[PDB]
Coordinates of C-alpha atoms in Angstrom, one line a residue:
Chain A
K13 CA 124.9 104.3 44.6
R14 CA 125.8 107.9 43.9
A15 CA 128.1 110.9 44.6
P16 CA 126.7 113.8 46.6
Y17 CA 124.3 116.4 45.0
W18 CA 122.3 119.3 46.2
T19 CA 118.6 118.7 46.7
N20 CA 117.6 122.4 47.3
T21 CA 119.8 125.0 45.7
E22 CA 117.2 127.8 46.0
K23 CA 118.1 128.3 49.7
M24 CA 121.8 128.7 48.6
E25 CA 121.3 131.6 46.2
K26 CA 121.8 134.2 49.0
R27 CA 125.6 134.7 49.0
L28 CA 126.2 137.4 51.7
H29 CA 124.5 137.1 55.1
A30 CA 124.8 140.3 57.2
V31 CA 123.3 140.3 60.6
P32 CA 123.0 142.4 63.7
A33 CA 125.0 141.0 66.6
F34 CA 123.3 138.8 69.2
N35 CA 121.0 137.2 66.6
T36 CA 121.3 133.5 65.7
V37 CA 122.6 132.6 62.2
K38 CA 121.7 129.4 60.4
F39 CA 123.3 128.1 57.2
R40 CA 122.0 125.2 55.2
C41 CA 123.1 122.9 52.4
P42 CA 120.4 120.3 51.7
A43 CA 122.0 117.3 49.9
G44 CA 121.6 113.8 48.8
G45 CA 123.7 110.8 47.8
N46 CA 124.2 107.1 48.4
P47 CA 125.4 106.2 50.9
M48 CA 124.2 109.2 52.8
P49 CA 127.0 111.8 52.7
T50 CA 128.3 113.2 56.0
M51 CA 128.6 117.0 56.7
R52 CA 131.3 119.2 58.1
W53 CA 132.0 122.9 58.2
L54 CA 134.9 125.2 57.5
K55 CA 135.4 128.8 58.7
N56 CA 137.7 130.6 56.2
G57 CA 138.8 127.4 54.5
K58 CA 139.9 125.7 57.7
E59 CA 138.2 123.1 59.8
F60 CA 135.6 124.8 62.0
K61 CA 136.3 123.8 65.7
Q62 CA 134.0 124.1 68.7
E63 CA 136.7 126.2 70.4
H64 CA 136.9 128.7 67.5
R65 CA 134.2 130.8 69.1
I66 CA 132.7 131.3 72.6
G67 CA 129.9 128.7 73.0
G68 CA 131.0 126.9 69.8
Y69 CA 128.3 126.0 67.3
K70 CA 125.6 123.4 66.6
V71 CA 124.4 121.4 63.6
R72 CA 121.4 119.5 62.5
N73 CA 122.2 116.7 60.1
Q74 CA 118.5 116.4 59.5
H75 CA 118.6 119.9 57.9
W76 CA 122.2 120.0 56.7
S77 CA 122.7 123.1 58.8
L78 CA 125.2 125.0 60.9
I79 CA 123.8 127.1 63.8
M80 CA 125.8 129.8 65.5
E81 CA 124.1 131.5 68.5
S82 CA 124.3 135.1 69.6
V83 CA 126.8 136.1 66.8
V84 CA 129.3 138.9 67.3
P85 CA 131.6 140.9 64.9
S86 CA 134.4 138.4 65.4
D87 CA 132.2 135.7 63.8
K88 CA 132.6 137.6 60.5
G89 CA 134.0 135.4 57.7
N90 CA 133.4 132.6 55.2
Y91 CA 131.6 129.4 56.1
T92 CA 131.8 126.3 53.9
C93 CA 129.7 123.1 54.2
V94 CA 131.5 120.0 53.0
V95 CA 129.3 117.1 51.9
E96 CA 131.1 113.8 51.4
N97 CA 130.7 110.1 50.8
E98 CA 133.0 107.4 49.3
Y99 CA 132.0 108.4 45.8
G100 CA 132.7 112.2 46.0
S101 CA 132.6 115.6 47.6
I102 CA 130.9 118.9 47.1
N103 CA 130.9 122.2 48.9
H104 CA 129.3 125.6 49.2
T105 CA 130.6 128.8 50.9
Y106 CA 128.5 131.5 52.6
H107 CA 129.8 134.9 53.7
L108 CA 128.8 136.2 57.1
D109 CA 129.0 139.8 58.3
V110 CA 128.0 140.8 61.8
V111 CA 127.2 144.4 62.8
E112 CA 126.6 145.6 66.3
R113 CA 123.7 148.0 66.8
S114 CA 120.9 149.1 69.0
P115 CA 118.4 151.9 69.6
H116 CA 120.0 154.3 72.0
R117 CA 119.7 158.1 72.2
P118 CA 122.8 160.1 71.0
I119 CA 126.0 160.2 73.1
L120 CA 128.2 163.3 73.0
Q121 CA 131.9 163.5 73.6
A122 CA 132.5 165.1 77.0
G123 CA 134.1 168.5 76.8
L124 CA 132.6 169.7 73.5
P125 CA 131.5 172.3 72.8
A126 CA 134.2 174.1 74.7
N127 CA 134.1 177.5 76.2
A128 CA 135.6 180.4 74.1
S129 CA 136.6 184.0 74.2
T130 CA 137.7 186.7 71.7
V131 CA 137.7 190.5 71.3
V132 CA 134.9 192.3 69.6
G133 CA 135.1 191.8 65.9
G134 CA 137.0 188.5 66.3
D135 CA 136.1 185.0 65.2
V136 CA 135.4 181.8 67.1
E137 CA 134.1 178.2 66.8
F138 CA 132.2 175.6 68.8
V139 CA 132.6 171.9 68.1
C140 CA 130.4 168.9 68.9
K141 CA 131.2 165.2 68.4
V142 CA 128.5 162.5 68.2
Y143 CA 128.1 158.8 68.5
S144 CA 124.8 157.6 67.2
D145 CA 123.5 154.5 65.3
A146 CA 120.1 155.9 64.2
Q147 CA 120.8 159.0 62.1
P148 CA 121.3 162.0 64.5
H149 CA 120.0 165.5 64.0
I150 CA 122.2 168.4 65.3
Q151 CA 120.9 171.8 66.3
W152 CA 123.1 174.6 67.6
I153 CA 121.1 176.7 70.0
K154 CA 121.6 179.9 71.9
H155 CA 119.8 180.6 75.2
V156 CA 118.1 184.0 74.7
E157 CA 115.7 186.5 76.2
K158 CA 112.2 186.7 74.6
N159 CA 109.8 189.5 75.7
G160 CA 111.8 190.5 78.7
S161 CA 112.8 187.1 80.2
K162 CA 115.3 184.3 80.0
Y163 CA 112.7 181.7 81.0
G164 CA 109.1 181.1 80.0
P165 CA 105.9 180.1 81.8
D166 CA 107.1 176.5 82.2
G167 CA 110.4 177.7 83.8
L168 CA 112.3 176.4 80.8
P169 CA 114.8 178.6 79.0
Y170 CA 114.1 180.6 75.8
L171 CA 116.0 179.1 72.9
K172 CA 116.9 180.3 69.4
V173 CA 118.0 177.7 66.9
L174 CA 121.0 179.1 65.1
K175 CA 121.7 176.1 62.9
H176 CA 120.7 172.5 62.4
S177 CA 121.3 169.5 60.2
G178 CA 120.1 169.9 56.7
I179 CA 121.2 169.8 53.1
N180 CA 121.2 173.7 53.2
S181 CA 123.6 173.7 56.1
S182 CA 127.3 172.9 56.1
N183 CA 129.4 171.1 58.7
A184 CA 126.6 170.3 61.2
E185 CA 128.9 169.5 64.0
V186 CA 130.7 172.9 64.1
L187 CA 129.2 176.3 64.7
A188 CA 131.5 179.1 63.4
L189 CA 130.9 182.7 64.6
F190 CA 132.5 185.5 62.6
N191 CA 133.2 189.1 63.2
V192 CA 131.7 188.7 66.7
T193 CA 130.0 191.4 68.7
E194 CA 129.4 191.8 72.4
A195 CA 125.9 190.6 71.8
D196 CA 127.0 187.1 70.7
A197 CA 128.2 186.5 74.2
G198 CA 126.2 183.9 76.1
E199 CA 125.5 180.2 76.2
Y200 CA 125.6 178.0 73.1
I201 CA 124.1 174.5 73.1
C202 CA 124.7 171.5 71.0
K203 CA 121.5 169.5 71.0
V204 CA 121.6 166.2 69.2
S205 CA 118.4 164.1 68.7
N206 CA 117.5 160.7 67.1
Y207 CA 114.1 159.1 67.3
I208 CA 115.1 157.4 70.6
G209 CA 116.0 160.5 72.5
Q210 CA 118.3 163.5 72.8
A211 CA 121.5 164.8 74.4
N212 CA 123.0 168.2 74.8
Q213 CA 126.0 170.0 76.2
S214 CA 126.9 173.7 76.3
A215 CA 129.7 176.2 76.4
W216 CA 130.0 179.9 76.9
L217 CA 131.3 182.8 74.8
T218 CA 132.9 185.7 76.5
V219 CA 133.5 188.9 74.5
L220 CA 136.5 191.1 75.5
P221 CA 136.2 194.8 74.9
Chain B
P19 CA 135.2 156.7 67.3
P20 CA 132.6 159.5 66.9
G21 CA 130.9 160.5 63.6
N22 CA 130.5 157.1 62.0
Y23 CA 126.9 158.1 61.1
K24 CA 128.2 160.7 58.6
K25 CA 130.2 158.2 56.6
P26 CA 128.8 156.7 53.4
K27 CA 127.2 153.3 53.8
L28 CA 125.8 150.4 51.9
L29 CA 122.2 149.6 52.8
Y30 CA 122.1 145.8 52.8
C31 CA 118.8 144.0 52.4
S32 CA 118.4 140.7 54.3
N33 CA 115.6 139.5 52.0
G34 CA 118.0 138.4 49.2
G35 CA 121.3 139.7 50.2
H36 CA 121.4 142.7 47.8
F37 CA 122.8 146.2 48.3
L38 CA 120.4 149.0 47.6
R39 CA 121.6 150.8 44.4
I40 CA 120.6 153.9 42.5
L41 CA 120.8 153.8 38.7
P42 CA 121.6 156.9 36.7
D43 CA 118.4 156.2 34.7
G44 CA 116.5 156.9 37.9
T45 CA 115.4 153.3 38.4
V46 CA 116.5 151.6 41.7
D47 CA 117.3 148.0 42.3
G48 CA 119.5 145.7 44.4
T49 CA 122.7 144.0 43.4
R50 CA 124.9 141.5 45.3
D51 CA 127.7 143.2 43.3
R52 CA 129.6 145.0 46.1
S53 CA 131.8 146.6 43.6
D54 CA 128.9 148.4 41.9
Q55 CA 129.7 152.1 42.1
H56 CA 126.0 153.1 42.6
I57 CA 125.5 151.6 46.1
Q58 CA 127.5 154.0 48.3
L59 CA 124.8 156.0 50.1
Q60 CA 125.0 159.1 52.1
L61 CA 122.4 159.4 54.8
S62 CA 121.4 162.6 56.6
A63 CA 118.7 163.5 59.1
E64 CA 116.8 166.5 57.7
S65 CA 114.5 166.4 60.8
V66 CA 114.6 164.2 63.9
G67 CA 114.2 160.6 62.7
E68 CA 113.7 161.8 59.1
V69 CA 116.4 161.1 56.5
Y70 CA 117.5 161.7 52.9
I71 CA 119.4 158.8 51.2
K72 CA 121.8 160.1 48.6
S73 CA 124.1 158.3 46.1
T74 CA 127.7 159.5 46.7
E75 CA 128.3 158.7 43.0
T76 CA 125.5 160.5 41.2
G77 CA 124.1 162.8 43.9
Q78 CA 120.6 161.5 43.3
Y79 CA 118.1 161.2 46.2
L80 CA 116.3 157.9 46.9
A81 CA 112.5 158.5 46.6
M82 CA 109.1 156.9 46.4
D83 CA 106.3 158.1 44.2
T84 CA 102.5 158.2 44.6
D85 CA 102.4 154.5 43.7
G86 CA 105.3 153.1 45.7
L87 CA 108.0 152.9 43.1
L88 CA 111.6 153.7 44.1
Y89 CA 113.2 156.4 41.9
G90 CA 116.4 158.3 42.2
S91 CA 115.3 162.0 42.0
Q92 CA 118.0 164.4 40.8
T93 CA 116.7 167.1 43.2
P94 CA 115.6 166.7 46.8
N95 CA 111.8 166.8 47.2
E96 CA 109.2 165.6 49.7
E97 CA 109.2 162.1 48.2
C98 CA 112.9 161.6 49.3
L99 CA 112.3 161.8 53.0
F100 CA 112.0 158.5 55.0
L101 CA 111.5 157.6 58.6
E102 CA 114.5 155.5 59.7
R103 CA 113.7 153.1 62.6
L104 CA 115.4 150.1 64.1
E105 CA 113.1 147.1 64.4
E106 CA 112.9 144.3 67.0
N107 CA 115.8 142.3 65.7
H108 CA 117.9 145.4 65.2
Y109 CA 117.6 145.9 61.5
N110 CA 116.8 149.3 60.0
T111 CA 113.6 150.0 58.2
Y112 CA 112.7 153.0 56.0
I113 CA 109.1 154.2 55.7
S114 CA 108.1 156.8 53.2
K115 CA 107.2 159.9 55.2
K116 CA 104.9 161.2 52.5
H117 CA 103.0 157.9 52.7
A118 CA 103.8 157.0 56.3
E119 CA 100.1 156.3 57.3
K120 CA 100.1 153.5 54.7
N121 CA 103.3 151.8 56.1
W122 CA 105.0 151.9 52.6
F123 CA 108.5 150.7 53.3
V124 CA 111.6 150.9 51.2
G125 CA 112.3 147.3 50.2
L126 CA 113.8 144.8 47.8
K127 CA 112.5 141.4 46.6
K128 CA 114.6 138.2 46.7
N129 CA 114.9 138.7 42.9
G130 CA 116.6 142.1 43.4
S131 CA 113.5 144.1 42.3
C132 CA 112.0 146.7 44.6
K133 CA 108.8 145.5 46.3
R134 CA 106.4 148.4 45.7
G135 CA 105.3 150.2 48.8
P136 CA 101.7 148.9 48.8
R137 CA 103.1 145.4 48.8
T138 CA 105.5 145.9 51.8
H139 CA 104.4 144.6 55.2
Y140 CA 106.0 144.6 58.7
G141 CA 106.8 140.9 59.1
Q142 CA 108.7 140.8 55.7
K143 CA 112.4 140.2 55.1
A144 CA 112.2 142.6 52.1
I145 CA 112.1 145.7 54.4
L146 CA 114.9 144.6 56.7
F147 CA 118.0 146.6 56.0
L148 CA 121.5 146.7 57.6
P149 CA 123.9 149.6 57.1
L150 CA 127.4 148.3 56.2
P151 CA 130.7 150.1 55.8
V152 CA 132.6 150.6 52.5
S153 CA 134.5 147.3 52.5

């Protein structure tokens, strides 16, 4: 006869478990004892109940494990396995973190950049706001004329990159124009790209004489 | 809430549960120590799908040398650029751009020690990373 004890502590060295949402998480606590100990789980120090999450959870007493399907942010917390028998009790707590994320092209906030105006010699700025998981790359572009035309052989517009994300550039999401001239007038584009795809929105600059 | 990408982050490795960390002495490892001041990383896309990974504490840039060792360069060079991709289970992976053809990933072993590029393979937990906030 004996109080509970861990049979495989190696699988318990990993303290923090951080996972992307919608994946299945499994926690284990292989144990021994005589008589065979029973197993129960706590979520944040309190009894873990089937109604504590949509769909509840599952367990495999053969594997001393807790299984939570399609996890979401709200599942974040501490999970404790409690192993008991008439002679004693032992426990172990894991921490779970759930982050939602997926490969989607950038999404821009509607309305930005916004149109702008100012007199010759004045200053102005264009702003762009981005939502993107995979690191986004921002280029500020102006539609220009190259060799006598606004559009090339492919019908597409001639573009000049004025600024783009980089350690040699500051404040990627804002394009500030200073001591403007009637030549700066035109269409400015905020093009944001990640490896999945791109997005872009534009605004105009009007120069008053 | 736009602009979350430009906030510092911890790069969590699912292999052992460590946080990627840059040590002043240039060496790089992983620590479950979430208080460690050398794990707050600033990511930026120098080109589409190409990123720099910089310590907000020391200003060093994560990098991989001709062998596959992860060092924290004081100045940004061509060994500091990585290709950030999301994998099938939605974890991030970082492949050395300079050695991209050889599939040399950024990775940590269960024992917290970087798993040299030549030793990293697709189906490994060592390369699976998850960006987490500062808390």
